[PDB]
Symmetry: C2
Subunit: 534 residues, 2 copies
C-alpha cells in the first residue's frame, strides 16, 4: 500500500535519493529522463546508493558451505524444511540489498540433497521405532516434510517484507530435475501452488514459477517427467504460473550448456566462464536498466506531419550514445564501493564469491560476469510511425552498438525487453504532452511492450507466437511472449498445444487466462499478476 | 552496521523525519531537546509519521481467530512449529510498524494449545503406523517438534530484519505456566538459549528472555517448576538472560491480577479494564517517551558554584510542564490518523481490537489503555549536585504531576526509568558544553541510569538490591535493577541467592556477569547485551 509505515519511510528515502541523483547524474542525462527520451530505472535507489539490480542467488554454494546471516553462522541444512526456511531468510536479505528481483534457479536440483537428508532421518527413525511399514513410512513422512516446506516457503515470501515494506520479487525455477527427490520438489511446488495461499486459497503474485521443458524429460508423453508437465499445465490453468522456458532455444540463445533462469522477471545472462574455464551462472547479476523510448525517436524525427528518415538515423545514433553514457555514469558510481555495503551479497556467498570487507565490489562485475541492460519499448508504435516493420532491424542495430560498448568497457551490455508495467504509461504521457493524441501511437494511452504484437490485433495464438519468436533471438538480454486464452481449466490438451508450439519456436513464454474464485480476481495485463479491480 | 543498504535507506528516512519534526514541534520544545534539557525520543520517526512506541502483542487473539498477514488469510496453527513460524512473521511485521520493542507475553501459556495439537498428531500417527511405544513415540516427537520450533523462532529473530535493516527488539516472557505443555515450552526456550546461536553457539542479543518467579510455582525447592528455575539459573549464568520478574511485587505495583510483562526493555503498563470490566493486557501499547534531564535542572539552578534550592523548584515546575507539552504535542499528531497506517496493528489484531480501515487510531489509546512515558535519568548525579539524597522524593513529586496530567487528558502517564543506552552520553556531553567537567557529575562522561547506584560504588549485591528496590514501587512505568557478579557458571546456588533476594524485594531484575567463549565476548554495561570490544 502507501499509507503504510514501511512504504512511507521508503518513499522518504526515495525522495532523498532522487535529489541526490540530481547532483550525480550529468544534467543532459537527467533532462533526457525527465522528458521521456530515455528512462533511467530505479533512480530512487541508484546512484544515491551503489545498489545493483537483479540476480541468480548462489543458494547451492551457501547451503553447502555455510555462511554468516547477520550474527549467526548458519550450517548446512540437515533437513529440507530447514533449507527452505533458510532459503526464505536469504530471499528477505537479498531483496533488501539490491533493488531488483531475486531468482533461485533449479530449486529442484539444488534442494534435492536436503530431501535425501530428510529421508535418511525418517528411515533411521523407522528402525528406531521398529515401524511396520519402513520404506513406506519414509516415503510418506518425507513427502509431507517436502510439501509443508515449500508451502511454508511460499507463505513466508508472502508475509515477509523487504526494507521497503514490500513483498520481494522472487522467481523460482525448476523442471530439469529427474531424480525422485528432484521430481518430488517439483510436484510439491506445483501442488502447493494449485492449493493456493491461505484460508481462501487465493492466487499468489509471488514467487513467480518458471519451468524448463526439454525433449526427453518434459514435453513428450514418453519422457520421465511428462506427468509433472501435466500437473504444471493444470497449475498454469488455475494460477497463471508457471511460465515455461524452452531448454532447447534457451541454451542456443544464451550460449550456456545448461538452461538459463531469468533473474527477476525476464533478464537473461549470456554464457560466462571463470578463470579456470568453468561456466558460471549462479551468483551472477545485472547492473541496471536504462530504457530507450523508441516511439519518441520516431516522433521527434517527424517534420510537420511526415516521417524524416535521415532525421531518425541521426537521433537514433545520438540516443544510443546517450543511453551508453547513462549506463556508464551509474556503473561508475560503483567505483571505490566496498563489500561492507552488503555482506549477504558480497561476503557470505549470494554472488558466488567471498570478498573481504575491504575489497571493491566493482571488480566482481567486470569482463562480462555481470550483465548491463539497454531496454526499449513500443516496436508496434514505432512501426506505425515509420511506415513499416523495422522491429527486427532496429534491434539488430542496437545489438551492434551493444557489441561495441562491451568491447570498449568490458561490461556485458545486452538488449532487454523492459517489463515496463508502468513505464508504458509514463512514456506515452510525456510524449503526449508534446504531441498530443497521435492515432495508433499515443491515443490509447500506453505503448506496447517491447516487441509484442499489439493487444488490439486479432491474432491466433500460433500466429502471435510465430510473429514474436524471432525477437527472442535478438533481444538476448531479456524477452518473453504472452498469449491470451479463455478459461482452459477444462481444456488442458489445448493449453499443452500452445505450450508445445511456443516451446519449439521461442524462449521464455507464458499464458494469460482469467483466474477468479468467489472473488479473488487475477489478471496479467502486463508483467505481473494483479487484481484489475483497483 | 551503517555502511549497509537497509541502514542507509533508514538514515535517509530519519533525516527527512527530523526535518519534518522541525516543522511540527513548537520551537521551544525543539530548543529544549537540542540543548539537552529534555530528550524527545525517536524524533527520527515521530511526529513525521504517526508511529507509536512499544507493545504487548495479542498473539493469543491472533492465533485463535485468524488474521490477514499481507495478502494471506492465516488460520489457527495446526502445529507448534507453524505457530512459532507465524510468531516470527508477526514479530517482523509489528517491528516495522512501531519504532519500539515488541513483547510476546507468556508464550508458555499462549502457545500451549499448539503443543497439544502437535501431540494429538503424533498419537494419531502412533496408531496409523502401529508404533510399538505409542505414548512414548508422541512424548519424543512432540518434544523435538517443540525444541526445533523455538530454536527456529530464535534463529528467525536473528536473521530477519525490520524495515530499518535492524534486528527487532523483541522480548519473550514465560514462567507462570505449570501444565506439561507449558513446562515443555519453557524448557525448550531455556535449553535452546544455552545451546546458543549458530555453529559457534554464540550468545543472542535478542530475544530478551524474562521469567516470572512466584512462590508455589518457581522459587522454592518444593514448587512444581523449581527444576525450570534451576535451568533458568544455568541459562542466566551462560547467556545473561533470563532476567526475572517477581510475580508478587509486579502485581502489587501494576495493580494487575496477572504478572505484567514489560513491553520492549522495561516499560510496564498499569491495570486497565475494557468496557465490560475485563482486565486487558495483551494488545496494549505505549505512545512515546520524553526524558527529563535531572542533573541539568540542578546544574542550571547553581548560582556561581552553589546550589540554589528556590531556583531548583522553579525550574523543576517549568520543565515538568515542558515535558507535558512535549508528550501532548506528539500524541496530538495522532489525531485524524487512520487504521490504514498499520493493518497488522490496528486491523488484524496485534493491538487486540479490529478497527475498520477508516477508524481513527487515537480513540484506541485513550482513557488509560495506552501508557505514555515521562522518562528521567541520573538520580545519582542529581543527589551529588543538590547535596543530599532526593531520589525517592523528586520521583514522588513527578508522579503527583503525572496523576494530574492523567486526569486532565485521559492518557495514562507513568514514570519511566529510561534505558538510555546512548542518552547517558548525550545528556552529559550537552551539559559539558556548558559547564565543562564537574567533579562526580559530568567528569566520567555519562550519567547514571535512572535510580541505579553508581557503578563506582563498592556495594554488596544485597545492599544494591536493597538501596534500589523502593524505586521499583515509585517509577511504575518502567524500572529494573542490575547487580554485577563474577562468573557464576559453577556457583548457581550463589546466583539463586541474589535472585531470591531481588525477587522478594523488587520487581524486574537481572544479573550482569561475563560471558565469553573462544572469542564471543558479551557484556551488559547498560541496557542491552553487546560486545564491548568495538
Amino acid at each position: 500500500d502507501s499509507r503504510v509505515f514501511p512504504t512511507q519511510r521508503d518513499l522518504m528515502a526515495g525522495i532523498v535519493s532522487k535529489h541526490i541523483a540530481k547532483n550525480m547524474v550529468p544534467s543532459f542525462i537527467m533532462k533526457a529522463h525527465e522528458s521521456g527520451i530515455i528512462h533511467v530505472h530505479d533512480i530512487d535507489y541508484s546512484p544515491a546508493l551503489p545498489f545493483t539490480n537483479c540476480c541468480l542467488v548462489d543458494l547451492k554454494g551457501m547451503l553447502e558451505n555455510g555462511f554468516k546471516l547477520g550474527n549467526a553462522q548458519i550450517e548446512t541444512p540437515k533437513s529440507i524444511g530447514v533449507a527452505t526456511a533458510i532459503m526464505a531468510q536469504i530471499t528477505a536479505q537479498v531483496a533488501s540489498h539490491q533493488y531488483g528481483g531475486t531468482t533461485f534457479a533449479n530449486v529442484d536440483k539444488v534442494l534435492s540433497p536436503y530431501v535425501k537428508r530428510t529421508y535418511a532421518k525418517h528411515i533411521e527413525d523407522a528402525e528406531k521405532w521398529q515401524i511396520a511399514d519402513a520404506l513406506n513410512y519414509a516415503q510418506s513422512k518425507t513427502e509431507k516434510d517436502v510439501y509443508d516446506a515449500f508451502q511454508a516457503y511460499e507463505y513466508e515470501v508472502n508475509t515477509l517484507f523487504s526494507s521497503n515494506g514490500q513483498t520481494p520479487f522472487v522467481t523460482i525455477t525448476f523442471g530439469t530435475g529427474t531424480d525422485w527427490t528432484e521430481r518430488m520438489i517439483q510436484k510439491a511446488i506445483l501442488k502447493n501452488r494449485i492449493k493456493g495461499l491461505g484460508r481462501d486459497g487465493i492466487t499468489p503474485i509471488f514467487p513467480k514459477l518458471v519451468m524448463f521443458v526439454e525433449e526427453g524429460v518434459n514435453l513428450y508423453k514418453d519422457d520421465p517427467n511428462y506427468d509433472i508437465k501435466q500437473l504444471a499445465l493444470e497449475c498454469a490453468s488455475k494460477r497463471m504460473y508457471p511460465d515455461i522456458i524452452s531448454a532447447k532455444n534457451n541454451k542456443a540463445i544464451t550460449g550456456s550448456s545448461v538452461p538459463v533462469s531469468p533473474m527477476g522477471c525476464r533478464s537473461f545472462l549470456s554464457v560466462w566462464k571463470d578463470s579456470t574455464g568453468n561456466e558460471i551462472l549462479d551468483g551472477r547479476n545485472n547492473l541496471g536498466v536504462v530504457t530507450l523510448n523508441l516511439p519518441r525517436i520516431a516522433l521527434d524525427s517527424y517534420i510537420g506531419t511526415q516521417f524524416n528518415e535521415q532525421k531518425f538515423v541521426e537521433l537514433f545514433n545520438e540516443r544510443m550514445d546517450l543511453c551508453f553514457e547513462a549506463l556508464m555514469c551509474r556503473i561508475s558510481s560503483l567505483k571505490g564501493v566496498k563489500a561492507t555495503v552488503a555482506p549477504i551479497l558480497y561476503q557470505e556467498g549470494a554472488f558466488g564469491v567471498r570478498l573481504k570487507p575491504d575489497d571493491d565490489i566493482i571488480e566482481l562485475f567486470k569482463n562480462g560476469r555481470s550483465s548491463v541492460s539497454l531496454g526499449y519499448i513500443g516496436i508496434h508504435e514505432l512501426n506505425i510511425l515509420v511506415g513499416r516493420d523495422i522491429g527486427r532491424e532496429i534491434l539488430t542495430k542496437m545489438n551492434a552498438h551493444l557489441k561495441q560498448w562491451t568491447e570498449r568497457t568490458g561490461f556485458a551490455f545486452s538488449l532487454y525487453s523492459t517489463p515496463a508495467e508502468n513505464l508504458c504509461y509514463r512514456f506515452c504521457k510525456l510524449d503526449t504532452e508534446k504531441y498530443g493524441s497521435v492515432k495508433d501511437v499515443t491515443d490509447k494511452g500506453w505503448y506496447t511492450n517491447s516487441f509484442h504484437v499489439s493487444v488490439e490485433e486479432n491474432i491466433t495464438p500460433f500466429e502471435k507466437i510465430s510473429r514474436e519468436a524471432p525477437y527472442h533471438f535478438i533481444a538476448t538480454g531479456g524477452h518473453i511472449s504472452y498469449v491470451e486464452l479463455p478459461d482452459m481449466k477444462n481444456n488442458l490438451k489445448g493449453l499443452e498445444a500452445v505450450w508445445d508450439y511456443a516451446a519449439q519456436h521461442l524462449d521464455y513464454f507464458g499464458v494469460n487466462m482469467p483466474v477468479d474464485k468467489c472473488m479473488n480476481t487475477i489478471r496479467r495485463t502486463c508483467a505481473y499478476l494483479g487484481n484489475p479491480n483497483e
